[PDB]
Design a protein around this ligand. Sequence first.
Ligand SMILES: Nc1ncnc2c1ncn2[C@@H]1O[C@H](COP(=O)(O)OS(=O)(=O)O)[C@@H](OP(=O)(O)O)[C@H]1O
Ligand SMILES: Nc1ncnc2c1ncn2[C@@H]1O[C@H](COP(=O)(O)OP(=O)(O)O)[C@@H](O)[C@H]1O
Ligand SMILES: Nc1ncnc2c1ncn2[C@@H]1O[C@H](COP(=O)(O)OP(=O)(O)O)[C@@H](O)[C@H]1O
Ligand SMILES: [Cl-]
Ligand SMILES: [Cl-]
Lengths: 179, 181
Amino acid sequence: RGLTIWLTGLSASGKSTLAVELEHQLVRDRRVHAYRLDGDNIRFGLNKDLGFSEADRNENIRRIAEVAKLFADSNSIAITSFISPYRKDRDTARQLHEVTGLPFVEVYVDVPVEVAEQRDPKGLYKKAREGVIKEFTGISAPYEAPANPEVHVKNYELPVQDAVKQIIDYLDTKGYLPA
Amino acid sequence: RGLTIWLTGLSASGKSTLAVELEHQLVRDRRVHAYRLDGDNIRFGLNKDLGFSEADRNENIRRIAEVAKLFADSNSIAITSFISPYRKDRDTARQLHEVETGLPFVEVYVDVPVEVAEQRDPKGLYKKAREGVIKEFTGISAPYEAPANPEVHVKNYELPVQDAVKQIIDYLDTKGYLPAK
Ligand SMILES: Nc1ncnc2c1ncn2[C@@H]1O[C@H](COP(=O)(O)OS(=O)(=O)O)[C@@H](OP(=O)(O)O)[C@H]1O
Ligand SMILES: Nc1ncnc2c1ncn2[C@@H]1O[C@H](COP(=O)(O)OP(=O)(O)O)[C@@H](O)[C@H]1O
Ligand SMILES: Nc1ncnc2c1ncn2[C@@H]1O[C@H](COP(=O)(O)OP(=O)(O)O)[C@@H](O)[C@H]1O
Ligand SMILES: [Cl-]
Ligand SMILES: [Cl-]
């Protein structure tokens, strides 16, 4: 049975890492298909005409909610992994999934802006600090944190494993998994 | 690894009839996920922002192809069911698929004479179209540009629905695209 698992968080909070690992640990021990949507899949393809302005981030997320729904529909598990900083847009995505039913599991990949910054794998934070990148989430643009996430991962000083296992463990707390 | 099967043909050429049957026979006899993309799927969701401008027409086809590829990349078999009249529109679609190596894009020409199409006409569209009730209708007040060399060219008439589906599935076997039975 199909649902969408929606990760939301700052950049360098470790979403994509979780996604990959959530997936492999799902198809390892329950063996479902799960497909997994983030920047490579989507921003170089479907969402190629979209930048990082507010309206574009709205649309970016709009489109992604619709194709995630599509994947859950096909009885796969869609695993999204975009910053998705606008609470309204995440709430709207939920509502297209939930109108006769499709779970929407919002996972807050939570780190402090300072843990992320201290990571900064591709140097965007230092660039955002300097003004080289404009409107950067958490530095010069908003991140609107989830109030009631199905799952709240404090993803710092924490093994990706216990992280994914907080997610899995929630999934069958609710019944979406096989043996 | 999956692939996209791209149906193209006039209205009432029978794309969706074969799309349905194709999934059914694929999922059923080869134990392989397939999934259908069509107007009921796509027009009021992903592309509900798109209109009838030439640029929205192109963008409609563009987006459809992208999410077909995502299905293809996810290891299902995507099956699209759009008139997709413009051949430069299926060029856009073909090209982003073939892009290690790329994903197979099987263009299927669902070929019926336009007079076979109007004679079926299950929704009365061709009738509204000859009246002018409906505007810019493929084959009547807008062109269909037939594929120059489809992977599969199905003359889908005077031929049972399940035999035309076998024509397609047999071509897939030709490429090793599918698992055995
Ligand atoms: N202006 C700006 N603000 C925030 N992030 C930026 C920006 N410009 C490029 N990037 C890179 O894009 C990645 C986040 O992309 P998203 O599709 O998730 O953005 S969003 O969901 O519409 O908030 C994010 O992480 P990665 O893609 O994993 O490298 C950044 O690297
Ligand atoms: N639990 C963790 N503890 C420490 N570092 C982590 C953890 N999870 C991920 N990271 C690191 O954080 C960096 C950015 O993570 P990534 O998954 O690319 O972020 P996102 O996809 O959310 O932008 C990566 O280099 C990764 O190695
Ligand atoms: N091979 C076939 N033989 C006989 N009738 C067919 C065949 N394929 C489709 N049809 C019929 O043609 C009509 C329109 O086809 P449909 O699949 O709705 O067309 P479209 O290509 O417009 O999606 C339907 O009534 C369908 O049963
Ligand atoms: Cl730079
Ligand atoms: Cl079309």
